[PDB]
Amino acid sequence: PIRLRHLYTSGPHGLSSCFLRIRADGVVDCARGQSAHSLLEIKAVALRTVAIKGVHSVRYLCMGADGKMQGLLQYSEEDCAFEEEIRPDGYNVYRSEKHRLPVSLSLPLSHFLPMLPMVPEEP
Numbered sequence: 001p002i003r004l005r006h007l008y009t010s011g012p013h014g015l016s017s018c019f020l021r022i023r024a025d026g027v028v029d030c031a032r033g034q035s036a037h038s039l040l041e042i043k044a045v046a047l048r049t050v051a052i053k054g055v056h057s058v059r060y061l062c063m064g065a066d067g068k069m070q071g072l073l074q075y076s077e078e079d080c081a082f083e084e085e086i087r088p089d090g091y092n093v094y095r096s097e098k099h100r101l102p103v104s105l106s107l108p109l110s111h112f113l114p115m116l117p118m119v120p121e122e123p
Helices: none
Strands: 002-009 018-022 028-031 040-046 049-054 060-063 069-072 081-086 092-096 113-115
Touching: 018 049, 028 069
Parallel strands: none
Antiparallel strands: 002 018, 002 040, 002 113, 018 028, 040 049, 049 060, 049 081, 060 069, 081 092
16 A cells, blocks of 8 residues: 655754655755655555655665665665654654664654645556
8 A cells, every 4th residue: 555645854943844855866855845856655565564765766765874864776675664653743753673763864853744745646
């Protein structure tokens, strides 16, 4: 099962707007608003486990050294499969078992709300 969403977070001071963006060059960063490279495919691999892929970069969201996120053309479940956990604020944490860390865009910037796209689209 697939959801097309944009993942939103903000920082500890609550001033920023950060949509997780997987760029064509593999950099993962923040965008202020929803854009083409922030549209993500969140695939429910099993139970609460997800794989997340940038629709337009066709890159998987993967965790590397120190928990630093990157976009890779090839999926590796150990680095790119996450446990999706709802939090009291209504946002999710995406936990990497291998890395023992949450997905974060720094932890700050680790609660992500899957927001619907402002316009419709098919996978």
